[model samples]
Target: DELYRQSLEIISRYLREQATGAKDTGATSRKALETLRRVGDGVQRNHETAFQGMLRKLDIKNEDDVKSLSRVMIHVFSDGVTNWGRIVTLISFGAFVAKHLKTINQESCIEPLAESITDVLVRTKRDWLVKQRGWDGFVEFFH
Candidate 1:
């Protein structure tokens, strides 16, 4: 009963929002709502799978498990990935590395290592984005 109520509330709210944004009445808002529910399910399922994969790689069983691996994980997250969330993750990783470098690596070469990795990631992102749409296009995107 609780699940049913929540489902109805979610679907109804979604339909109402769609109905307000319609450019055409060819497909009823109910149809849009149904399509969106299906799409949302798939998208969330994909996210769950990817998130689980990341957790497995990090050897995390729970949120608590993440704390221990966060340092190196932060490093990799900065070193390269091209998803929409990668920007924020990269920023977080950069800050984390900066804050923890001395304590994390304990090597004279650690700072250089972090910089090298960051440069590679930035270079990769730039190269990819450039191929997609030249340097000007990439600059405009960040701007």
Candidate 2:
């Protein structure tokens, strides 16, 4: 369980460090980021239609508290949970959400968003990650 929480910490930290041009280390975060970034780029292009509907469904107005943000991630993850692509979609979409939070100057939301994401996968895809080996499972599967 901590492995996944730790794995997600790396992924979340990677995104934060990029803007500051900070240090990068650990193969797990690097490889994991590469996969998410690749998937997000193509996923963003291919399915930009993908995320808007959720923001709309949630109708995030002048702002979004992390509580609603948590729900947002839930539907996004739940919508397409049967396959790896859905997990990719979920993580990539969180990338977008992280970006959106940055844009809105809600850096406060970032930590909660990351934790919620970890919990979502912990709850929803626990077994899949077990079979695949958690986030390192992500590494091997992406390879």
Candidate 3:
């Protein structure tokens, strides 16, 4: 419990610092941020090692094993580079890689990667850019 508490304190402080631009505060804040990352790594490794052993006890094998453990791992590793928050984005990225990485290693499956996720983000970015430039609002305003 104390390890967990320390881990959380380290994380909370680092996140607060990030949100407030404490990196601009100079050396002390930067050092604090690094300390938080190092300590968090240690705690995560210790906790995950123990947890993996528990998972092994279940004799999980293949994608089904991952499907089951992914739920739990998602909860644990959801905290991203900053060390705080729900971290759904990171989990989503992990799932994306998990689902697509094998396809990437095979040349034939590459076409859909561009047609799917890349195209979607580009389309969304174009829409966002248009809104930011007030181009989308011009017609509405004119009418």
- Model 1 is weakest, by summed lDDT over 10 consecutive residues, at 18-27
lDDT of 1 by residue, 46-122 (tens): 56555445434654333344344544554555464475235323333322333233333332222333343334344
| Residue 59, candidate 1: C-alpha displacement in angstroms | 13
The lDDT per prediction is 0.39, 0.63, 0.35
lDDT of 1 at 36: 44
Better of 1 and 2 by TM-score: 2
Candidates arranged by TM-score, highest first: 2, 1, 3
Across residues 28-59, which tens digit of lDDT does each residue of candidate 2 receive?
66677776666655776787675777655654
lDDT of 3 by residue, 30-105 (tens): 4534644454344445555543455456443344544565455434542333211222122223223322334334
The regions of model 1 sitting more than 4 angstroms off are 1-81, 102-110, 122-126, 132-139
Q: Better model by lDDT, 1 or 3?
A: 1
Best lDDT goes to which candidate?
Answer: 2
List the candidate 3 regions with Cα displacement exceeding 4 Å.
23-33, 37-143
What's the residue-level lDDT of 20 in candidate 2?
Answer: 32
TM-score of each: 0.29, 0.73, 0.22
